[PDB]
């Protein structure tokens, strides 16, 4: 089924992709690979052709490459960017060294949209609901984005959203308190927290937690949510961290009502449930969708869950060529959407 | 000032004036040494070039020599011709000495070389918006050679504004305002710069947090609050007049010649340096608000698979 490949050097970098891809325009890249916007003659859609020329330079790289693929291949949801295509100019495993990922380039990222337009409460309502609907699907497979930010959310003119660029590691602002200072093994809710941070910004138009350093940021957060309690401290793995915490000031929880005056009460109500200090007390994706702040959009029949994602590989100690082989197999097993 | 001639993009074949990623070419009648950047001809590639062209004045900015509107292959290509700077990449030179200690005053003799350019560009209402290693260069390889900069791929037109804010908030917390812009835009350069003085000093990254303060850090507390006013947030952000109105920069070359360990730490390990290089490019692209993205339609007019479904059941009920 090997299509025809056409090579062309774009900005001092070689690109060998199938002919179905035309008009490749370098749209950026960073140390994980370069990116090139293009037109997929197969689906008549503007896609993002990512090339990872350094996929197996280390067991850390090899695994992270296999992880990204596995995750991508699994994502089959409306509000979640899925794998449109994955290929390699390699004719065998021996010569296999470059891997290309192909997704759908939809509209522009939330950040940009903000800079050019003042969204209405209605917009936020639908936007955030979509983020949650996608999260429920993800978390359902037991996955955690870990890097949700207005720069990782694609939206078009129709207001359609999509969660993308998952944290593949296993500008600090949209990160929970625990994960930021690595207080303990994170919870799926850590994405919820980020959700809040996004939500707040949209409504106010200002960044909720624009903290300079971890300490500075932490102080910022704890000033609104307050300071830990004996229950939270318990969950603290690091003794040094627990020690630091105890050393802090008073910090009684702030009433959100006064912080966002003029905004939809239902909204502010939602923000309190999401922005809880105790990750074990933060509203879940499923629960949120049920919140009255999404009454106009909530359908318990049209919020679907995902199949089981086998993360067993995470605990697999293998060599670079084995992680390379595993990645190649997946590349060959790929079955394109409809 | 002094009215200068406008830019006229020579329509003729570039191959008749010079002799067959920036590429080198050798002119015919001078046989000069001569950097050439190529692209897909269009208004953004022309608007930018017009800006880069009108930005050759400053001795701190690379000089474009000739702009041709030609037809390579099937497409029309706007081929610029510029003054080559074989001095070498800024972080390429330092990375690879040797013994010699990059002394504080040297780092200062650098920021001014860059703070001078910004002061120029910004004074003509031009926002560069792209400050990273790959775009900074020296001119010769020997001594007494100055550094003038490159790659205006992301510069644009800022608009004439002005800067205060203080102390303390009120009861309506927060609200909204003019989203680029004549201020915010400029604050994407200073970030690039301050974010450079730090990668210049500890050769570490704000990923901010200063070194332990022990450890290659003396710089002064006057050297901490500076990289801090440059660092975070783009409203009271560090002001290219205020920055140039600083003794450390203004009266540079008098500053201590404190020896540094920056060149040894970064050179110690030159692969995370590439990784750091990406995040800088990623960081920037994430704070640059320039090319329109969409203009989301009112939810009432918007129509998509999800909305339809919700509206359908909304009527069954």
Curated annotation (Swiss-Prot), chain A:
This is Mitogen-activated protein kinase 14. Its cofactor is Mg(2+). The TXY motif contains the threonine and tyrosine residues whose phosphorylation activates the MAP kinases. Keywords: Acetylation, Apoptosis, ATP-binding, Cytoplasm, Kinase, Nucleotide-binding, Nucleus, Phosphoprotein, Serine/threonine-protein kinase, Stress response, Transcription, Transcription regulation, Transferase, Ubl conjugation. GO terms for molecular function: ATP binding; enzyme binding; MAP kinase activity; MAP kinase kinase activity; mitogen-activated protein kinase p38 binding; NFAT protein binding; protein phosphatase binding; protein serine kinase activity. SMART domains: S_TKc (SM00220). Serine/threonine kinase which acts as an essential component of the MAP kinase signal transduction pathway. MAPK14 is one of the four p38 MAPKs which play an important role in the cascades of cellular responses evoked by extracellular stimuli such as pro-inflammatory cytokines or physical stress leading to direct activation of transcription factors. Accordingly, p38 MAPKs phosphorylate a broad range of proteins and it has been estimated that they may have approximately 200 to 300 substrates each. It is an enzyme of class 2 (transferase). It is found in: Cytoplasm; Nucleus. The modification Phosphothreonine is found at residues 13, 249. The modification Phosphotyrosine is found at residue 309. It comes from Homo sapiens (Human). CDD domains: STKc_p38alpha. Activated by cell stresses such as DNA damage, heat shock, osmotic shock, anisomycin and sodium arsenite, as well as pro-inflammatory stimuli such as bacterial lipopolysaccharide (LPS) and interleukin-1. Component of a signaling complex containing at least AKAP13, PKN1, MAPK14, ZAK and MAP2K3. Within this complex, AKAP13 interacts directly with PKN1, which in turn recruits MAPK14, MAP2K3 and ZAK. Binds to a kinase interaction motif within the protein tyrosine phosphatase, PTPRR. This interaction retains MAPK14 in the cytoplasm and prevents nuclear accumulation. Interacts with SPAG9 and GADD45A. Interacts with CDC25B, CDC25C, DUSP1, DUSP10, DUSP16, NP60, SUPT20H and TAB1. Interacts with casein kinase II subunits CSNK2A1 and CSNK2B. Interacts with PPM1D. The modification N6-acetyllysine is found at residues 50, 149. Gene3D superfamilies: Phosphorylase Kinase, domain 1 (3.30.200.20), Transferase(Phosphotransferase) domain 1 (1.10.510.10).
Curated annotation (Swiss-Prot), chain B:
Expressed in all tissues examined. Staurosporine binds at residues 83-85. A motif (Bipartite nuclear localization signal 1) lies at residues 295-298. The modification Phosphoserine is found at residue 252. Activated following phosphorylation by p38-alpha/MAPK14 following various stresses. Inhibited following sumoylation. Specifically inhibited by pyrrolopyridine inhibitors. It holds the Pfam family Pkinase. There is a cross-link at residue 277 (Glycyl lysine isopeptide (Lys-Gly) (interchain with G-Cter in SUMO)). ATP binds at residue 37. A motif (Nuclear export signal (NES)) lies at residues 280-289. Residues 290-314 are annotated as: p38 MAPK-binding site. It is found in: Cytoplasm; Nucleus. Changing residue 258 to A: Slight decrease in kinase activity. GO terms for biological process: 3'-UTR-mediated mRNA stabilization; cellular response to vascular endothelial growth factor stimulus; DNA damage response; inflammatory response; inner ear development; intracellular signal transduction; leukotriene metabolic process; macropinocytosis. Stress-activated serine/threonine-protein kinase involved in cytokine production, endocytosis, reorganization of the cytoskeleton, cell migration, cell cycle control, chromatin remodeling, DNA damage response and transcriptional regulation. Following stress, it is phosphorylated and activated by MAP kinase p38-alpha/MAPK14, leading to phosphorylation of substrates. Phosphorylates serine in the peptide sequence, Hyd-X-R-X(2)-S, where Hyd is a large hydrophobic residue. This is MAP kinase-activated protein kinase 2. The gene is MAPKAPK2.
């Amino acid at each position: 089924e090997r299509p025809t490949f056409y090579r062309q050097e774009l900005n001092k970098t070689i690109w060998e992709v199938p002919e179905r891809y035309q008009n490749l325009s370098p749209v950026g890249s960073g140390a994980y690979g370069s990116v090139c916007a293009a037109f997929d003659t197969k689906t008549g859609l503007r896609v993002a052709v990512k090339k990872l020329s350094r996929p197996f330079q280390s067991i850390i790289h090899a695994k992270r490459t296999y992880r990204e693929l596995r995750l991508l291949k699994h994502m089959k949801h409306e509000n979640v960017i899925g794998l449109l295509d994955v290929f390699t100019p390699a004719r065998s495993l021996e010569e296999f060294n470059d891997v290309y990922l192909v997704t759908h380039l939809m509209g522009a990222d939330l950040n940009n949209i903000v800079k050019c337009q003042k969204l209405t409460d209605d917009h936020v309502q639908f936007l955030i609901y979509q983020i949650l609907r996608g999260l429920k699907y993800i978390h359902s497979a037991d996955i955690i984005h870990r890097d949700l930010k207005p720069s990782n959310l694609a939206v078009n003119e129709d207001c359609e959203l999509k969660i993308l660029d998952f944290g593949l590691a296993r500008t600090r602002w949209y990160r929970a308190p625990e994960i930021m200072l690595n207080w303990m093994h994170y919870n799926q809710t850590v994405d919820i927290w980020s959700v809040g941070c996004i939500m707040a910004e949209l409504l106010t138009g200002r960044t909720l937690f624009p903290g300079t350093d971890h300490i500075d940021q932490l102080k910022l957060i704890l000033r609104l949510v307050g300071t830990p309690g004996a229950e939270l401290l318990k969950k603290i793995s690091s003794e040094s961290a627990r020690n630091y915490i105890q050393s802090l000031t008073q910090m009684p929880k702030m009433n959100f009502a006064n912080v966002f005056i003029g905004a939809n009460p239902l909204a502010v109500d939602l923000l309190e449930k999401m922005l809880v200090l105790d990750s074990d007390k933060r509203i879940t994706a499923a629960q949120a969708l049920a919140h009255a702040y999404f009454a106009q959009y909530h359908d318990p029949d049209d919020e679907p869950v995902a199949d089981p994602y086998d993360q067993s590989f995470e605990s697999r100690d293998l060599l670079i060529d084995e992680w390379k082989s595993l990645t190649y197999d997946e590349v060959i097993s790929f079955v394109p959407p409809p | 000032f002094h009215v200068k001639s406008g830019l006229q993009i020579k329509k003729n074949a570039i191959i008749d004036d010079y002799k067959v990623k920036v590429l080198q070419i050798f002119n015919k009648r001078t046989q000069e040494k001569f950097a050439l950047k190529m692209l897909q001809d269009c208004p953004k590639a022309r608007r930018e070039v017009e800006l880069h062209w009108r930005a050759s004045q400053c001795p701190h900015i690379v000089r474009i020599v000739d702009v041709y509107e030609n037809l390579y292959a099937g497409r029309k290509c706007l081929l610029i011709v510029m003054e080559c700077l074989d001095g070498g990449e800024l972080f390429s030179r330092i990375q690879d000495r040797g013994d010699q200690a990059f002394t504080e005053r040297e780092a200062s003799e650098i920021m001014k070389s860059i703070g001078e350019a910004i002061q120029y560009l910004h004074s003509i209402n031009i926002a560069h918006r792209d400050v990273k290693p790959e775009n900074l260069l020296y001119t010769s390889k020997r001594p007494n050679a100055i550094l003038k900069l490159t790659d205006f791929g992301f510069a644009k037109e800022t608009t004439s504004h002005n800067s205060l804010t203080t102390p303390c908030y009120t009861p309506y917390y927060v609200a909204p305002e003019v989203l680029g812009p004549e201020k915010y835009d400029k604050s994407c350069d200073m970030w690039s710069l301050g974010v450079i003085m730090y990668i210049l000093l500890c050769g570490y990254p704000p990923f901010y947090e200063f070194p332990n303060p022990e450890w290659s850090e003396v710089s002064e507390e006057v050297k901490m609050l500076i990289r801090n006013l440059l660092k975070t947030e783009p409203t009271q952000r560090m002001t290219i007049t205020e920055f140039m109105n600083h003794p450390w920069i203004m009266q540079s070359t008098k500053v201590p010649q404190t020896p540094l360990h920056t060149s040894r730490v970064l050179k110690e390990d030159k692969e995370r340096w590439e990784d750091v290089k990406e995040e800088m490019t990623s960081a920037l692209a994430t704070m640059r608000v320039d090319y329109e993205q969409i203009k989301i339609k009112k939810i009432e007019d918007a129509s998509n698979p999800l909305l339809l479904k919700r509206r359908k059941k909304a009527r069954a009920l």
